[PDB]
Design an enzyme around this catalytic site. Structure first.
Site, mmCIF file in Angstrom:
data_model
loop_
_atom_site.group_PDB
_atom_site.id
_atom_site.type_symbol
_atom_site.label_atom_id
_atom_site.label_comp_id
_atom_site.label_asym_id
_atom_site.label_seq_id
_atom_site.Cartn_x
_atom_site.Cartn_y
_atom_site.Cartn_z
ATOM 1 N N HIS A 116 39.421 61.223 30.852
ATOM 2 C CA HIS A 116 39.374 61.725 29.484
ATOM 3 C C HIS A 116 40.739 62.125 28.953
ATOM 4 C CE1 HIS A 116 34.834 62.420 29.454
ATOM 5 N NE2 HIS A 116 35.105 62.050 30.693
ATOM 6 N N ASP A 126 37.336 66.509 23.143
ATOM 7 C CA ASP A 126 36.423 65.824 24.040
ATOM 8 C C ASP A 126 35.019 66.401 23.907
ATOM 9 O OD1 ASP A 126 36.763 63.775 26.437
ATOM 10 O OD2 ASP A 126 35.271 65.262 27.056
ATOM 11 N N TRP A 174 48.182 58.036 44.020
ATOM 12 C CA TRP A 174 48.110 57.582 42.637
ATOM 13 C C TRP A 174 48.900 56.289 42.507
ATOM 14 C CZ3 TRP A 174 45.192 59.374 38.651
ATOM 15 C CH2 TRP A 174 45.489 58.909 37.364
ATOM 16 N N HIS A 183 35.043 50.420 39.802
ATOM 17 C CA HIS A 183 33.844 51.231 39.650
ATOM 18 C C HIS A 183 33.298 51.198 38.230
ATOM 19 C CE1 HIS A 183 36.536 53.885 37.634
ATOM 20 N NE2 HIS A 183 35.707 54.914 37.617
ATOM 21 N N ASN A 235 38.242 53.295 31.220
ATOM 22 C CA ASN A 235 39.685 53.092 31.130
ATOM 23 C C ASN A 235 40.114 51.873 31.934
ATOM 24 O OD1 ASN A 235 40.697 55.529 29.559
ATOM 25 N ND2 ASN A 235 39.474 56.517 31.163
ATOM 26 N N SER A 236 39.666 51.791 33.190
ATOM 27 C CA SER A 236 39.972 50.633 34.023
ATOM 28 C C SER A 236 39.417 49.345 33.428
ATOM 29 C CB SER A 236 39.411 50.842 35.431
ATOM 30 O OG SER A 236 39.747 52.123 35.934
ATOM 31 N N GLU A 247 41.670 48.388 30.408
ATOM 32 C CA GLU A 247 42.951 48.029 31.009
ATOM 33 C C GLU A 247 42.889 46.639 31.632
ATOM 34 O OE1 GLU A 247 43.665 51.342 33.599
ATOM 35 O OE2 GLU A 247 43.834 52.713 31.892
HETATM 36 O O1 LIG Z 1 45.300 55.477 41.343
HETATM 37 C C1 LIG Z 1 44.963 55.504 40.150
HETATM 38 C C2 LIG Z 1 43.634 55.718 39.663
HETATM 39 C C3 LIG Z 1 43.400 55.723 38.339
HETATM 40 N N1 LIG Z 1 44.401 55.524 37.417
HETATM 41 C C4 LIG Z 1 44.114 55.545 35.974
HETATM 42 O O2 LIG Z 1 43.151 56.554 35.728
HETATM 43 C C5 LIG Z 1 42.167 56.083 34.779
HETATM 44 C C6 LIG Z 1 40.813 56.025 35.441
HETATM 45 O O3 LIG Z 1 39.796 56.318 34.459
HETATM 46 P P1 LIG Z 1 38.437 55.511 34.419
HETATM 47 O O4 LIG Z 1 37.792 55.816 33.120
HETATM 48 O O5 LIG Z 1 38.663 54.040 34.754
HETATM 49 O O6 LIG Z 1 37.578 56.112 35.613
HETATM 50 P P2 LIG Z 1 37.181 57.638 35.769
HETATM 51 O O7 LIG Z 1 38.272 58.188 36.688
HETATM 52 O O8 LIG Z 1 37.086 58.332 34.452
HETATM 53 O O9 LIG Z 1 35.853 57.572 36.526
HETATM 54 C C7 LIG Z 1 42.696 54.748 34.261
HETATM 55 O O10 LIG Z 1 43.482 54.926 33.087
HETATM 56 C C8 LIG Z 1 43.525 54.241 35.441
HETATM 57 O O11 LIG Z 1 44.568 53.374 35.013
HETATM 58 C C9 LIG Z 1 45.710 55.313 37.810
HETATM 59 O O12 LIG Z 1 46.624 55.138 37.016
HETATM 60 N N2 LIG Z 1 45.916 55.316 39.168
#
Ligand SMILES: O=c1ccn([C@@H]2O[C@H](COP(=O)(O)OP(=O)(O)O)[C@@H](O)[C@H]2O)c(=O)[nH]1
Length: 471
Positions: free
Chosen positions: A17, A112, A330, A348, A352-353, A356
């Protein structure tokens, strides 16, 4: 248009978020409006300072909730008990967030949906409020369909999204706890002046813009993908936190590999599998024989583990076979997803993923867990056809090692090879993925759908500020 707008953004202390909302605020800033992020110092340090981009921070209440001083986000938490400590930290900051907004009221608040108290704050100050949840408009339309046509309290297995523009079957029913948690927030979010969507209409679907507008009676604003706001290497590499490994260490390694020969595995910032599930994933990775980048947040801070500890989740000799990189921390996800060597993304289905991967044109191997992900899975595979499915069907309540069912290694390898082996199905899946990637390259560019949506939104916000000056 004479004077810029003053917009405040209040993200939730969670990477899924926090990250998209700040990039949405950066889109407003490049237009020329004074945006202001209200978060904690650690969530603000990684934020790139743009034109008109500023932050207002309050110190994270570490010992009030009982967490280490370096933990100011859900991504740093590894425990459901730690997740609630982040929530209580949000409850404690609410006092100062409300006082700061009251003393210096903005032209518009964007918060949010996990913070529903912003409704009264925006109401008593009589300023327009926008809502943000990080979901797709498709997923929001689907969850609002179940909220109007609920499942019977004995349901199990697959179900159909009721009375929907398309006939889609989710592979598992939501837990009761998910409905009782999402329903109050969505109701308060619908009281806002409009919903910001980190997506674009070409990906969600016009039939769902018209569903949300005419059936649900609310306005949604497709401003995504927000990650496109980051253009340089350093902008794409510095997101959320600093990457654990040198960004150049990833690029040099990937630059030696073939195109579409590396698989990227990551399950977001809220999901942690037990050791037995990681063992299946690793066993399926080596049996597929493909080079990999595997993000394992479950083992961060556990380097130079004893052989007894590493054999809990890795086959013996897995690390000695150096066919990939284990990122126990990370990883620069935008940097890795954008490399030509990456051919698939075992994900998963976090939103965001997803967007992306859409911008990068990388087909996805879907493995949903909770939240909006089971809806996102079918948007990737059925509606848009830019991925395959592992076949999971456990919709958990907690992703902190809450999985009670083991996804077998053969099931994962079968899904990995369906995209990586270059079959006819995989070839046209990647062709549909590049089709969206070319469309995505200009949606926030001048003339794009998400660009013009931001222009219409800013005008209506400027209009409402002009009316408040009258009074
Ligand atoms: O090792 C990691 C894991 C996650 N992300 C970023 O963290 C976000 C993950 O959010 P997403 O909505 O995909 O999953 P959530 O964590 O909310 O379940 C995305 O922007 C990814 O690019 C990253 O940069 N590195």
């Amino acid at each position: 248009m004479d004077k810029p707008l003053k917009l405040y953004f209040i993200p939730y202390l969670a990477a899924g978020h926090m990250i998209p909302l700040c990039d949405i605020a950066a889109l407003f800033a490049s237009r020329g409006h004074f945006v202001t992020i209200i978060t904690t110092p650690l969530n603000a340090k990684i934020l790139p300072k743009y034109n008109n981009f500023n932050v207002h921070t309050f110190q994270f209440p570490s010992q009030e909730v009982g967490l280490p001083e370096g933990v100011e986000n859900l991504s740093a938490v590894t425990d459901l008990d730690g997740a609630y400590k982040i929530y209580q930290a949000m409850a404690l900051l609410r006092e100062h967030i409300e006082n700061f907004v009251e003393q210096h009221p903005p032209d518009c608040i964007v918060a949010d949906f996990l913070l529903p108290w912003v409704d009264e704050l925006a109401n008593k100050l009589s300023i327009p409020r926008l809502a943000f949840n990080g979901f797709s408009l498709f997923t929001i339309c689907a969850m609002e369909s179940l909220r109007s046509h609920p499942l019977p309290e004995d349901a199990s297995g697959p179900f159909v999204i009721p009375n929907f523009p398309q006939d889609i079957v989710i592979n598992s029913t939501p837990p009761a706890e998910s409905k009782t948690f999402m329903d109050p927030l969505f109701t308060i979010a619908l009281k806002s002046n409009g919903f910001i969507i980190n997506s674009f209409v070409e990906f969600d679907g016009e039939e769902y813009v018209k569903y949300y507008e005419k059936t649900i009676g609310h306005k949604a604003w497709h401003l995504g993908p927000a990650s496109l706001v980051r253009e340089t290497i350093q902008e794409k590499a510095e997101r959320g936190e600093k990457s654990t490994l040198s960004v150049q260490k990833f690029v040099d390694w990937l630059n030696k590999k073939r195109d579409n020969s590396v698989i990227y595995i990551s399950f977001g910032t809220m999901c942690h599998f037990p050791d037995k599930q990681l063992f299946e994933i690793a066993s399926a990775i080596e049996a597929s024989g493909y080079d990999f980048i595997w993000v394992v947040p479950e083992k961060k801070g556990k380097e130079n583990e004893s052989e007894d500890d590493k054999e809990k989740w890795l086959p013996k000799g897995f690390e000695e076979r150096d066919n990939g990189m284990i990122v126990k921390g990370w990883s620069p996800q935008m940097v890795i997803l954008g490399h030509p060597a990456v051919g698939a993304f075992l994900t998963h289905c976090g939103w965001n993923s997803t967007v992306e991967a859409v911008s990068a044109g990388v087909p996805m191997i879907t493995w949903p867990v909770l939240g909006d992900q089971f809806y996102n899975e079918k948007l990737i595979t059925q509606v848009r056809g830019i991925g395959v499915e592992v076949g999971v069907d456990e919709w958990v309540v907690t992703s902190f090692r809450g999985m009670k069912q083991l996804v077998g290694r053969d099931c994962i390898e079968k899904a990995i090879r369906r995209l990586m082996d270059g079959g006819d199905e995989a070839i046209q899946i990647r062709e549909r993925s590049q089709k969206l990637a070319k469309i995505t390259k200009h949606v926030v560019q001048e003339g794009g759908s998400s660009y013009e949506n931001l222009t219409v939104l800013i005008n209506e916000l400027k209009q409402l500020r002009d009316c408040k000056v009258l009074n």
